[PDB]
């Protein structure tokens, strides 16, 4: 369970003197998420009246 | 905490400091009343005039 090239592999984005560091780069694609989308449904369904500056 | 806290001035806020409200009241066409109502039986019967006679 061991190929005979095993201690003398080529390792890349595997750093450090015996190749067992993770240094690759991680793929983005743009998706970002965040609490979910409410619209309001009682606004028109009462009287108004402004008072606005007076 | 606002640094003007001690030093507002308020309009419509009278007393040794501005706590009472005189503020006025804004008034519309509004007035609230008894519902409305129809009448129905106007045509079940038989009908008879003797307004001047």
């Not at 750093?15 to 309001?40: K, Q, R, T």
């Amino acid at each position: 369970s061991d190929t005979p090239y095993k201690a003398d592999l080529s390792r890349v984005h595997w750093a450090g003197s015996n190749s067992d560091v993770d240094i690759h780069l991680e793929i983005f694609e743009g998706d970002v998420d965040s609490g979910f989308m409410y619209n309001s449904f009682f606004r028109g369904n009462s009287s108004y009246v402004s008072v606005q500056d007076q």
